[PDB]
Amino acid sequence: SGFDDPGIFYARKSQLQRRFKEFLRQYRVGTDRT
Amino acid sequence: LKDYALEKEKVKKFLQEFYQDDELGKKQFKYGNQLVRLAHREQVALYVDLDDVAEDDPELVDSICENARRYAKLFADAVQELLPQYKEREVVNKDVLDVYIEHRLMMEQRSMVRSPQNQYPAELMRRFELYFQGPSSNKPRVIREVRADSVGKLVTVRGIVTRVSEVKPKMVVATYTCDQCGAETYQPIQSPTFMPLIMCPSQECQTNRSGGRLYLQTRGSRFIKFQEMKMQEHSDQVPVGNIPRSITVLVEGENTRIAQPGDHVSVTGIFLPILRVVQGLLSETYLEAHRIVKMNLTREELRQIAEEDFYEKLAASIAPEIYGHEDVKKALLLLLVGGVDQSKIRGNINICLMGDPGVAKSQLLSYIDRLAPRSQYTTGGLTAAVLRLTLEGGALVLADQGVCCIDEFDKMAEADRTAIHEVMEQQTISIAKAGILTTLNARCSILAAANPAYGRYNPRRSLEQNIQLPAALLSRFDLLWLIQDRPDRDNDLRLAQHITYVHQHSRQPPSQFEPLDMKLMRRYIAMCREKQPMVPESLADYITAAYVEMRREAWASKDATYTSARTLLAILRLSTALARLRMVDVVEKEDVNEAIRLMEMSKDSLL
Amino acid sequence: TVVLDDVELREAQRDYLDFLDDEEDQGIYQSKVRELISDNQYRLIVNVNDLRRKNEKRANRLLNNAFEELVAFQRALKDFVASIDATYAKQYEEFYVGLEGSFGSKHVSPRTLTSCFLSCVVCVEGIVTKCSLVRPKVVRSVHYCPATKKTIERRYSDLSVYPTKDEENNPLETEYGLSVYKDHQTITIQEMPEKAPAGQLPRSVDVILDDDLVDKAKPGDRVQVVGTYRCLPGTFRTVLIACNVKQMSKDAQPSFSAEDIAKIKKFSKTRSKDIFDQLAKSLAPSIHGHDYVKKAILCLLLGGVERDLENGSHIRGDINILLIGDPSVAKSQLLRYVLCTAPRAIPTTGRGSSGVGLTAAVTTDQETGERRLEAGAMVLADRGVVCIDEFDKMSDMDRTAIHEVMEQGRVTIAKAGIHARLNARCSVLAAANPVYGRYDQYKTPMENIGLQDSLLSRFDLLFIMLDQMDPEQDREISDHVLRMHRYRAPGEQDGDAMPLGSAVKMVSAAFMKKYIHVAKIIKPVLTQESATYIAEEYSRLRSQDSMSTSPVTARTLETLIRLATAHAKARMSKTVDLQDAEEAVELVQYAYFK
Ligand SMILES: Nc1ncnc2c1ncn2[C@@H]1O[C@H](COP(=O)(O)OP(=O)(O)OP(=O)(O)O)[C@@H](O)[C@H]1O
Ligand SMILES: Nc1ncnc2c1ncn2[C@@H]1O[C@H](COP(=O)(O)OP(=O)(O)O)[C@@H](O)[C@H]1O
Ligand SMILES: [Mg+2]
Numbered sequence A: 001s002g003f004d005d006p007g008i009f010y011a012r013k014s015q016l017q018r019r020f021k022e023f024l025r026q027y028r029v030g031t032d033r034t
Numbered sequence B: 001l002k003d004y005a006l007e008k009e010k011v012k013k014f015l016q017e018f019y020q021d022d023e024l025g026k027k028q029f030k031y032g033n034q035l036v037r038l039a040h041r042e043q044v045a046l047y048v049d050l051d052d053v054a055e056d057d058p059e060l061v062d063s064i065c066e067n068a069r070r071y072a073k074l075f076a077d078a079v080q081e082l083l084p085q086y087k088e089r090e091v092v093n094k095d096v097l098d099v100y101i102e103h104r105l106m107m108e109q110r111s112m113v114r115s116p117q118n119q120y121p122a123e124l125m126r127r128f129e130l131y132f133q134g135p136s137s138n139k140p141r142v143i144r145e146v147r148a149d150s151v152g153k154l155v156t157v158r159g160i161v162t163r164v165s166e167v168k169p170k171m172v173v174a175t176y177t178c179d180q181c182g183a184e185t186y187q188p189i190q191s192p193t194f195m196p197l198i199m200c201p202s203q204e205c206q207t208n209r210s211g212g213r214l215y216l217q218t219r220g221s222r223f224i225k226f227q228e229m230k231m232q233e234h235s236d237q238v239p240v241g242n243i244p245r246s247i248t249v250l251v252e253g254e255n256t257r258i259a260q261p262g263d264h265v266s267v268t269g270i271f272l273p274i275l276r277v278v279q280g281l282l283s284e285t286y287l288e289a290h291r292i293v294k295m296n297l298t299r300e301e302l303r304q305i306a307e308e309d310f311y312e313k314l315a316a317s318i319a320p321e322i323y324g325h326e327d328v329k330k331a332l333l334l335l336l337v338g339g340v341d342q343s344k345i346r347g348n349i350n351i352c353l354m355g356d357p358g359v360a361k362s363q364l365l366s367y368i369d370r371l372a373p374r375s376q377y378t379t380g381g382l383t384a385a386v387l388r389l390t391l392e393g394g395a396l397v398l399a400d401q402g403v404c405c406i407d408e409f410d411k412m413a414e415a416d417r418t419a420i421h422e423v424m425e426q427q428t429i430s431i432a433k434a435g436i437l438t439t440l441n442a443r444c445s446i447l448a449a450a451n452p453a454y455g456r457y458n459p460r461r462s463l464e465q466n467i468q469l470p471a472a473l474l475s476r477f478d479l480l481w482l483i484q485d486r487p488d489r490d491n492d493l494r495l496a497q498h499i500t501y502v503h504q505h506s507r508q509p510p511s512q513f514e515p516l517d518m519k520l521m522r523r524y525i526a527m528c529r530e531k532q533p534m535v536p537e538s539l540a541d542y543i544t545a546a547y548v549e550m551r552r553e554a555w556a557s558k559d560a561t562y563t564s565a566r567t568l569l570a571i572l573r574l575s576t577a578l579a580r581l582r583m584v585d586v587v588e589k590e591d592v593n594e595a596i597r598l599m600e601m602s603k604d605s606l607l
Numbered sequence C: 001t002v003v004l005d006d007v008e009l010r011e012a013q014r015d016y017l018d019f020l021d022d023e024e025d026q027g028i029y030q031s032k033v034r035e036l037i038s039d040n041q042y043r044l045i046v047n048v049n050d051l052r053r054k055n056e057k058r059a060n061r062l063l064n065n066a067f068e069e070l071v072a073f074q075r076a077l078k079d080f081v082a083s084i085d086a087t088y089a090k091q092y093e094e095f096y097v098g099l100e101g102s103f104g105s106k107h108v109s110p111r112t113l114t115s116c117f118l119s120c121v122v123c124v125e126g127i128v129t130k131c132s133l134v135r136p137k138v139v140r141s142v143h144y145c146p147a148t149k150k151t152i153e154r155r156y157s158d159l160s161v162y163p164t165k166d167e168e169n170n171p172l173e174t175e176y177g178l179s180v181y182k183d184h185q186t187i188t189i190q191e192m193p194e195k196a197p198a199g200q201l202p203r204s205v206d207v208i209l210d211d212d213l214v215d216k217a218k219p220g221d222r223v224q225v226v227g228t229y230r231c232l233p234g235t236f237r238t239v240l241i242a243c244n245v246k247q248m249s250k251d252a253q254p255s256f257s258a259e260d261i262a263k264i265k266k267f268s269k270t271r272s273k274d275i276f277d278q279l280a281k282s283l284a285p286s287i288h289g290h291d292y293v294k295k296a297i298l299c300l301l302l303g304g305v306e307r308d309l310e311n312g313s314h315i316r317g318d319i320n321i322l323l324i325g326d327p328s329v330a331k332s333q334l335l336r337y338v339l340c341t342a343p344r345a346i347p348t349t350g351r352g353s354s355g356v357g358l359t360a361a362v363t364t365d366q367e368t369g370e371r372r373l374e375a376g377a378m379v380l381a382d383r384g385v386v387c388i389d390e391f392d393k394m395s396d397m398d399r400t401a402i403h404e405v406m407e408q409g410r411v412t413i414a415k416a417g418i419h420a421r422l423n424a425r426c427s428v429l430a431a432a433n434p435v436y437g438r439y440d441q442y443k444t445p446m447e448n449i450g451l452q453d454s455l456l457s458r459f460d461l462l463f464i465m466l467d468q469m470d471p472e473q474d475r476e477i478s479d480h481v482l483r484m485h486r487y488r489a490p491g492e493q494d495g496d497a498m499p500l501g502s503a504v505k506m507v508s509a510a511f512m513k514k515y516i517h518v519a520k521i522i523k524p525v526l527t528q529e530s531a532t533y534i535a536e537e538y539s540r541l542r543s544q545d546s547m548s549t550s551p552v553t554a555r556t557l558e559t560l561i562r563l564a565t566a567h568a569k570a571r572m573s574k575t576v577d578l579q580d581a582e583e584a585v586e587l588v589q590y591a592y593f594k
């Protein structure tokens, strides 16, 4: 039947997003004592 | 109007919680067992009887009938949910597809909200397939009656397969890999054709705008076995004033390779449209196949059968408009009932009718064609062919388990003469358009009709002298009747008087026995086919005695009367055929002697 | 911008329901719909004149305004059926109205169907030539959106276009069962070929059929259709939407005038014995001799009587004559006599009509690449006559199809998956000169032409006419030739010829045409006396068959039956006379025994 259209499914910006992601969540401040 | 999620619940209830007391009354969750088999890849297709759903929800069956494509997907997704429950063994990764499916599932599970595009299609979460089996309530629908109103519904039909394409792989879910990102891309397909994808819609490449160009990969994709075929109106349903009408049928999955041309099958499936514009769109239709199955009175009837002249009366009923040719009319009836094929033996009784023009040959064939259950009429296509690449059985193939009336037999093509020679030999047709000797079952009596060259028959000119057909091919026929229009003023006057009555009455002259309706005749035949009468060994002694006696007459006869073992074999067919007419499962001397009488008369026709 | 109430449509819808409310009155329409309910169809037939009787104004409104008025009427019909039975109404999405009765000026022909009738009901009469395949047409497509869990519709009605994505770009999967589809077929009508002036061009009108009206028509059917003539979107193509189709009998009737009937009756009653020969002499007066041929040709026009039997045997009443003879003999002249005289005849050559040929054919349109089953010359001559010239030059496929139509009067076709079976009962008058001229009176006529030994059997008669070089015969012919040549009209001074026209005892050809048209309706039947007599003669021919044309056979017997039937029609004698059988027998003897 030709009367339907099912939907298609599935130094880099995504890599840069990971760098921001790890930075915001994994950045450490203070020291061993603090 | 109704919530598909609610329907999804009902089927899940039904499948998980339907059972049937099987052999020995075994309460067994039939579909539940099948799901377990499917969970371990032990099944592929899941045929479903709607009457099971009717057993607890006839309304659901009705809604399935008024629309079937919807409920197929509902059940398929319903089964998709149930299967992970019923998994109990980690069966071996049969074929790359399952381990590929396992690989994707781990990747998806490695991911949380998600856009609908970043999720696998249902069609790829497969390697099981689902089909319905129509309810016994739904009477089968003639192909003519499948109108535009019934599109979208589930219908059961009967017919004869005129042609079927080879199996080929149909794509279902086209898979692609991006040029420069790890995200995999999918594309379900519904249309018979499509534009393949170019640029990946992957989030990474979409964000990166790298132009990740999709490259198709067959291994990721998922195909399905597929076939294309045409089915023709069964001869019984066709009105006399019309011709059979075709219908395309699409077959896929395990329904593939369950049909051949000339198979009198019954198909249950959805009738749906396809588009390969005025006041709306015009779209060609087809029948998506689900289930294919190759198919196969009053006391006065018994009192009539007991009558001695019963079979003679039936012979008189063969074309009562036709005056004369009574013994020939008896012979035609023998062909209609056919042999037994005891064991194997050629049950079909092929007859050829050579004679001068204007002696009711063509009319007789037309009557026989109208009378027999499976009937074909041709003149000479007749035999199979390979059209374009797809088989296409000719009239000979379509006559299977029936009769093929060939008028104008004298003007056959010599290749076709060879073809029927194969049919009379082994009842199969071989053909090779591309050097591929495809053999096809052709089990069908041949009722040939020829006319001698150069006007009427010359008695002085021998057989195969008034006619230019192979004498060996002629001798293959069980019976061969020579009809001559000798001027006999008395008999000529009789026939004319018969004709003038018909003109002055539009009716046959009244005979001793009135003719029976053709349907009633066919009912007697179908009753006659019920029997397979046997030959006692005592009869063989007398039968063989008669054979050597007539064979001696052939030696005495200066002209070779073609007496042979072939002659004996047909006599067996005639005798047991007469036994079927007698409705007695043992042949008799009367049957044997009468068969000899007709054989002698056919030889006497050569006088 | 959303309509609330239509007072006019309300009244019109009410009035139709009142008209269909035929209970206190004679009950005819209530019985009709009750029969419609029982018969399960969904298209009432209506006599327009009864609607005029109950409401002339509404009937005028219906004829002048079609699309709106019918829609109201269908509404009244659907409610009325719902009144009698709700569930049966609910089975069908809709119901339809069939018009009938006398249409005063709206009853036109394709020639006279001008553009003035646009959006007016029209009752066209004509002949179907082109037919298209049955196709299912979508009208109401139903879609489901799993993203939104939402079901939508889209009607098309009179009105990329197919919706497949939600406005949110969610996928839409169609609902085939919920959606509405209807079979749909297109055909083309033309004016009846007999009543169609040659000067005027063809005026072919398209037709659209839907629902049960789809298959109620084939090519070469004389049909009256009533429908609404509408333009199309774009100088605009125009088509007729059928509201009801009916197949008028191809027999029709010889309307003429009672004066013509009275003159015919007086002429028939004058001399019934000589009327056959008097017509025969006056049949082709320009031609000299060939008297048996003229007698035979008259029988062909008269035609026998078709006998349809209980088993469906369909012994044809048509008669078939083949003329073979040396060139420069009045063969082509004789057929043009038949064309001028025959009530319903179609000329043709060996090649036949362009593309379609003699019999029907399938034709790709090539404007849309669309199949069309197009009627050929043979089918169009159904219950008529066809005059074939250069019949020897007929093509081989036609030499195949001719066997079917000669045997059955019925051309079947399955090409391009187009199953059809067209009525083609037509007496045929073929003509073909001998090959290389100069017929040899030694071999068969087949040996001189090559008719494959079968079509000669099919032809009831076969007449040979050779240019025997008798000086006496030549004097008789040349006397006739110069007598016609020397003739001048009564008003003329032996001066000018006829003007160069810009337009195209002895009885008038038109008078002959009207007379034989009347005679064809007569249905003469056998007499036992003649039946006994002919049986003696046929057996006598079989006795005379001892010497050795084709032999006398059962084909010859029925040929004599038709000839005696034909001569019986000539005198309007409803009982076949021994004279009829007598004249046929001697005529056949001439045909086979010179
Ligand atoms: N024995 C017969 N009894 C009754 N009718 C007959 C008989 N023989 C011939 N006829 C009539 O002859 C008419 C015309 O000849 P017919 O159709 O039988 O030819 P045919 O034998 O089929 O010839 P061919 O094979 O040469 O085409 C038919 O209408 C048929 O009714
Ligand atoms: N018996 C005849 N009487 C009068 N004219 C004749 C006769 N035979 C032939 N003709 C003449 O023959 C001409 C027509 O010949 P035509 O029928 O076209 O030849 P063919 O049919 O053999 O091709 C006419 O002009 C006509 O005058
Ligand atoms: Mg025949």
Ligand SMILES: [Mg+2]
Binding pocket: C331, C332, C389, C390
């Ligand atoms: Mg000519």
Ligand SMILES: [Zn+2]
Binding pocket: B178, B179, B180, B181, B182, B183, B200, B202, B204, B205, B206, B211, B212, B213
């Ligand atoms: Zn990418």
